[PDB]
Every structure is written in C-alpha cells, then in structure tokens.
C-alpha cells in the first residue's frame with residue numbers, strides 16, 4: 001500500500017519492519033522530529049536543521065566514528081500526519097548511498113493485549129560501483145534494523 | 161622501573177576517542193607460565209612461590225564514542241592482575257601445564273570479562289556495584305596490550321591496533337590486525353551466516369572495518385572480543401616496543417616506525433612518569449603520522465627495552 005518501489009537495474013530496493021509495544025501517537029511523535037533523528041537513530045552524533053519542519057526541509061547529520069561514512073545531507077520529501085508517512089532522500093554527504101530514498105510508515109496494532117505499533121521502512125538506492133544489489137540491501141538492512149530496534153527501545157521506555 | 165613514553169592527539173578528528181594505559185608493577189607474573197615446575201625444582205626454587213614484577217601497556221582505539229576505550233584503560237589492567245593472581249594460586253594445584261594455552265586462556269577470559277562488563281552481562285564494582293551496560297550497543301574499542309617483565313613480553317591483541325617490536329633494528333610484528341577480509345576471519349564470519357562486504361574497505365556486514373573488538377554488542381556474534389596472544393622471550397637485540405592505534409599504522413609502516421623510534425631514543429641520549437627519550441620517540445611518531453596525512457586520532461606508546 002505505501003512501500004511499493006520500482007527500482008531500475010542500476011538500483012536496489014528492500015524493506016524492514018519492527019513491532020513496538022507503544023501507541024502510534026508516541027512512535028510518530030518520535031519519528032516526526034525531523035530535526036532530531038538522534039532521538040532514536042543510534043549512529044547520529046549531531047544534526048543541524050534550520051526553519052520549520054516541512055516538505056523540502058534539509059538536515060545535516062554527522063554520524064559516529066567506525067562507520068563507512070561521516071556525514072549525510074537529507075531532505076524531507078513527504079510528511080503525512082494523518083496516515084503517518086515520512087519520506088526522506090539523501091541529497092548529499094560523503095557516503096556511497098547515491099539517490100537513496102526511504103519511506104517509513106507507522107500503523108496501529110495490538111501487542112500483548114495493549115496498544116502497539118508496526119513500523120515499516122523501505123528504500124531505493126543506486127548500487128555503488130564494485131558492489132552487488134544483494135550486498136547493498138544487506139548493508140542498508142543492517143543499519144535500518146539497528147535504527148528500528150533503537151526506536152522500539154526508546155518508545156517502549158517512554159510508555160513504561 | 162619501566163622506561164616508556166606516550167604521545168596522543170585527537171589529530172584532525174573532532175573528538176578524541178583513543179585511550180591508553182601504562183601501569184608499572186601492575187601484577188606479578190606466575191613463573192609457572194614461563195618455565196616448568198620440574199626445571200625450577202631442579203634448582204631448588206619453588207615455581208609457584210617465585211615473584212616476578214610486570215608492567216602493562218595498552219592502546220585502546222574507541223569507535224562510536226570514547227566510553228569503551230576509557231573503560232578498557234581503567235579496567236583491563238585490574239581484571240588482568242586479579243586473573244593472574246587467581247591463576248597462580250590455581251597453578252599451585254596443578255602439575256605440568258601447557259603454558260601458551262594458559263596465556264591464551266587468561267587473556268581470553270580477561271578480555272571477555274571486560275566485554276561482559278561493558279555490555280552489562282555481568283555486574284561490575286567501582287564500594288558500589290554496577291550492572292547496566294556502560295554505554296550504547298554500537299560503541300566499541302580495540303585493545304592491544306603488552307605485559308612486560310624482565311624476561312618476556314606477552315602481547316594480547318583484539319582489533320586493528322598493532323604492536324611492533326624493534327629487534328636488531330628490524331621490525332617484528334607481535335600482532336596481526338583483525339581485518340574482516342583476513343581469510344580465517346572471513347571464514348568464521350561467513351560460517352556464522354554473516355557477510356564481509358567491501359564498502360570503503362572490507363567491513364563486517366559492510367559496517368565495521370574490524371572483525372574483533374571489545375563492545376559492539378550489536379555486531380555479535382560476528383565481532384568477538386577474543387584476543388590473539390603472543391609470548392616472546394626478550395632478546396639481546398631488542399630496542400623497543402611500539403604500541404599504536406591505526407592512526408599511526410594507516411600511514412606509517414612497521415619498518416619506518418621501528419627505525420624512527422630507535423633512532424629517536426638514541427639521539428635523545430646523545431643530545432641530552434614518562435621517560436624523556438621514549439617520550440620524544442613517541443612524540444616524533446605522532447607528529448610524523450600527522451605530517452603524512454593521517455585523519456584519525458593518533459596514540460603511540462614507545463617502551464625502551466634496553
């Protein structure tokens with residue numbers, strides 16, 4: 001419904017999902033703060049964003065050491081507070097994820113008889129020279145899984 | 161007693177995440193790890209009772225933050241000293257022993273215990289008990305340590321920091337970098353179902369450019385805290401030991417580091433806490449790495465072995 005992609009043959013696409021024992025309004029309140037991704041993203045060390053959070057907003061992220069890259073420039077491409085959809089594209093940085101675009105949706109659910117959230121995040125990206133589609137999807141998936149794990153932990157710590 | 165110098169800088173990096181340790185007389189080495197009980201008893205000496213002082217030097221290259229490198233700086237020598245004392249007491253209960261296996265085991269258990277303390281798997285003591293993880297799951301550190309005594313150097317390495325010995329003014333590698341594309345390391349990772357991906361260097365899952373570290377619990381079981389251990393008896397032609405993070409070794413070879421360190425020590429003595437000659441050698445290696453374009457934190461310990 002929301003995470004369809006048509007990657008070409010120079011691109012790859014995949015998705016990850018995570019169940020969170022927290023209500024949708026809380027998880028969305030975390031992920032909607034485009035100016036502060038470090039609230040749940042465990043690799044972000046600094047983020048700078050000027051102005052109001054709207055389509056076209058741009059944030060400058062520095063990531064922590066040990067990673068294949070150090071910085072990323074990211075543009076907000078979609079923000080839907082009714083259907084809870086967020087879409088971001090990587091427009092700059094010193095990394096190898098060219099024309100990366102991601103879509104994240106949050107959905108209500110019941111988990112252990114309590115209000116819960118299903119988060120899905122999909123992406124499309126160019127496969128960088130010297131790598132395969134499989135490797136690129138594997139790498140992005142590992143990172144996105146860390147991000148969604150931390151988002152689950154932060155949300156569930158807030159509800160407790 | 162130990163003659164050493166230590167130079168460290170964040171360099172052109174924003175924050176400093178290298179840490180280092182230099183602890184004289186940190187422990188007594190059980191002599192039963194160096195010679196058999198039978199041979200010493202032939203001389204009337206009790207191998208379980210003999211005391212040999214040892215000093216510990218260590219370089220800990222942190223990533224994701226400085227907290228695990230600093231924890232290693234504060235804890236590895238304490239855990240190792242306690243483990244060595246316990247091992248001496250338990251060797252008093254045993255016959256002949258394979259010595260290299262016990263060096264491997266004591267260092268493996270020490271590194272694993274520090275890792276478990278970092279990840280909150282075991283409780284730690286500071287007059288107070290600590291239990292939750294020291295920091296986040298994507299924070300880690302290398303650990304290259306050298307136990308130095310009068311007769312032997314024992315090296316335990318976990319990660320891509322490196323220690324080199326200058327012997328006969330020639331380099332001898334006392335540690336092999338744990339790089340993910342190393343054939344045995346790739347085989348181990350791939351046997352566990354993991355991937356080694358060339359993504360700005362060969363990396364575990366494409367993320368981390370080392371196959372072993374302390375911390376990094378989000379990359380287990382692919383990144384392990386298991387050290388590789390080398391026991392090297394000291395020799396006539398020993399000049400010095402060089403421990404350093406990859407901030408040095410990325411831009412300086414083993415050969416150049418050994419030559420520079422040894423000649424700096426000799427030049428200081430000709431021309432003229434830490435030792436000034438070894439400190440000048442470490443400062444020169446640091447500044448050299450900076451001059452040759454190193455981007456990273458740089459930490460260098462030089463131990464004069466003469």
Ligand SMILES: CC1=CC(=O)CC(C)(C)[C@@]1(O)/C=C/C(C)=C\C(=O)O
Pocket residue numbers: 041043063067068069070071072090093095096097102140143144147
């Ligand atoms: C942690 C990470 C490693 C890199 O090499 C690229 C980049 C700097 C973009 C970075 O943020 C990438 C993050 C990714 C893939 C997704 C996200 O966080 O939404």
Ligand SMILES: [Mg+2]
Pocket residue numbers: 065177178221222223457
């Ligand atoms: Mg570092």
Ligand SMILES: [Mg+2]
Pocket residue numbers: 221405406407456457
């Ligand atoms: Mg380094």
